[PDB]
Amino acid sequence: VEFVREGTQFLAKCKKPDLKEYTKIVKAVGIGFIAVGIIGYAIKLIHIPIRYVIV
Amino acid sequence: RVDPLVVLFLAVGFIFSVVALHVISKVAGKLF
Amino acid sequence: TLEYNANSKLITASDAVVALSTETNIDQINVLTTSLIGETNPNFTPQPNEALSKMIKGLFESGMKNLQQKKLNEALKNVSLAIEMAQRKRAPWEAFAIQLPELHFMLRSKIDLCLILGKHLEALQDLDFLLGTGLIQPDVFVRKADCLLKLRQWEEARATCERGLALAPEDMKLRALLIETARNLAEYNG
Amino acid sequence: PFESFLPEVIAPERKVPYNQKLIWTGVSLLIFLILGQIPLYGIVDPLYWLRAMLASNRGTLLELGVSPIITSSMIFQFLQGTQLLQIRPESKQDRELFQIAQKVCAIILILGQALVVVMTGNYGAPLPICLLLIFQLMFASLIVMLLDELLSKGYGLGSGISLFTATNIAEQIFWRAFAPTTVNSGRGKEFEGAVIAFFHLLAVRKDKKRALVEAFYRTNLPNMFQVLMTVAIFLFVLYLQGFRYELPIRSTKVRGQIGIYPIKLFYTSNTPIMLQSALTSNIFLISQILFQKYPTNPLIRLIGVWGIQMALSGLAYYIQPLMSLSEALLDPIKTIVYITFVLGSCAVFSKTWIEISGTSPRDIAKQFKDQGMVINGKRETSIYRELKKIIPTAAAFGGATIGALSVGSDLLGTLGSGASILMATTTIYGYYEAAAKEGGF
């Protein structure tokens, strides 16, 4: 039960983000992840009919 | 020795070559 | 192009319009060959000449004697002639650390003479050359500030006074010059 | 050391700005991703785990993927860890020889693996087609290796392996969400994507009070509730990224430098989870192979028995992940032993990795003595004792939190594995924080 005690002590000693920082971080992460995923999805989609036609 | 545009041109040539080989092999059977 | 004279051994540019670098190099080659004509030894030495230095000192003394006679008009001409001779008829390959100090010492006396006589612009230009060629001491900044204020350049006057104070701040004349230039500038604005 | 004259991309002499780096990252990613859809020409042992972990798919030019590069790098990393190569930083020629040896062994490894797969694969034994097919794979692996070297030299935001893995994870998450494909099983054509089928049923069925309850649960195909769980866990793990410990530090060789040294919670998230996943995949592989080859034996039955395929009543049965709450309430001791195993595994893996990779508190203390930096409000002879009281506990708690998030995602049944999501988030947050500490658009 000492391990969770030290964990709680460490989290109380850490720094939790505020709103103005949390919103900026979430905006950046969301836009980056979406920009990667949408490209992946579109390139996986477009190549179905072409790979069908040429093959 | 090699610049980034060289690598990009190599990749584009490779891809276009494979696609052209597919389309020629397909049209060969369709025409004859 | 270029034409070669026979008897004068002087290379002259026969073209109509030539750049400045070509002219300077041609003049340098002319002076070099003119000195090599007189210098007879095949292995010439950087050792300075003697008779030329003696003539230079003789002309310098002849000019300085006019100050003892209080002849303030011909002494300047004599010193100018001595400087011209020491600059012209001295071979270029002579030692640097012996041709520089003589020129500096004579030019300082010439600056003092020209400033006392009443010519100013020539004094300012001589001071600027002497200060740019590698000699920075409070014996120059005072006279430069004096000439600048005399021919009415105030911002540069304060600038040079401050640079001068930035090397030997314990002087008693730089501070008076700073006060006077500050007053003149406050009048020039106000 | 030997003579080597082989192609390689050159690094820039000056630092490249943010935009010329971002555009190159994007275009390199687009090329690598198009290289993954086009099928081979010579076509006329399914390993789902290895092809999902190594960013590879069968039937395309990218069937090999980054596996030879990563295995060569791992081999040389292990050889350097065992102090056999005795690489010394006092010389640059040795480093050049090592980095060129990496490539000259990677190429022959690609050749060997490709020969193996063409000799054993399901393509067929029946020579010009064979040389064409081996040349195709050779050229594709060469191009992907050049792309890796380029993005690693500095023209790109980071390495290539992590970026490609995050790309595959995000692509799979979106494809499981907005899938346009349909299936017809008695009832009719139904969309395989959550939002697509949701809106389709909202539009054409016109019976809302039933359409909502039918589309929200969807016990057979992915639904919107799983999407809600995924976005919730995403926001949670993103909020969990800012947790860090900050101690004040100052310099002594040069005075007037006051600063703060951060100690985060997600120290080495990436390695332990993929290592443990590889081990579980290998164990499942070997257990299935032995159960197929041998009908029954004492040790064969004890290691694992497969049933309805899934393992049952065996050591491999315990290590398998839980599907839903039904299996959880069915056998509590199984859930207990599985949870303890998955937590202890990530804990010990984090510990051995922080001990091997050279990020030990003694190493940090020695590095501080090198830089001369000292704690702001503490003495010099106590810095190592202070790192001993912070680093191990932080690493252990981070590993435990990663394990807890993974088991929670697996029990909730999200669209993708929690390990994949956390890897994607931490690797993209690395890029974000690098751009922040550097400063750019």
């Binding site: - | - | 950087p46 270029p92 390959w93 041709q99 100013h120 020539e122 050359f129 021919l151 | 000056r14």
Partner: protein, 138 residues
């Protein structure tokens, strides 16, 4: 903007016009002086060009052009020394010092000659009114 080809032109003209022999040595000393001056200039300009390059405000081609010029100047100087040796037997141990002095001396000579032209620029720029004797007449 160089005095290298001038020596070759003088040599070619000597090949036909039968000019005196000391003019050749004069042109050679001129070429040597120019070479030593450019060598010193490059040696003293290297660090600041390097800083402007590492700052990222000059491009990439000029850096290599500079590095090439570094060795081109040395090659030219070596060829000039070889030509000097060919010109006179046992005349290399003194030529270096003679060149080292004439460079500085003619540098000072040019700086001093510039003042006659420099004097009227200030007149034109400040709109002074100076009569003879160099005094001010308001």
């Amino acid at each position: 903007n160089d005095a290298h080809d001038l020596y070759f032109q003088i040599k070619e003209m000597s090949e036909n016009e039968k000019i005196h022999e000391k003019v050749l040595k004069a042109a050679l000393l001129n070429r040597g002086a120019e070479s030593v001056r450019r060598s010193l200039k490059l040696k003293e300009l290297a660090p600041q060009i390097n800083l402007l390059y590492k700052n990222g405000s000059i491009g990439e081609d000029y850096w290599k052009r500079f590095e090439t010029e570094v060795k081109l100047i040395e090659l030219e100087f070596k060829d000039t020394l070889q030509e000097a040796e060919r010109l006179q037997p046992g005349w290399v141990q003194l030529f270096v010092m003679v060149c080292k002095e004439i460079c500085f001396n003619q540098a000072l000579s040019r700086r001093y000659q510039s003042i006659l032209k420099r004097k009227e620029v200030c007149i034109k720029e400040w709109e002074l009114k100076i009569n003879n004797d160099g005094r001010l007449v308001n």
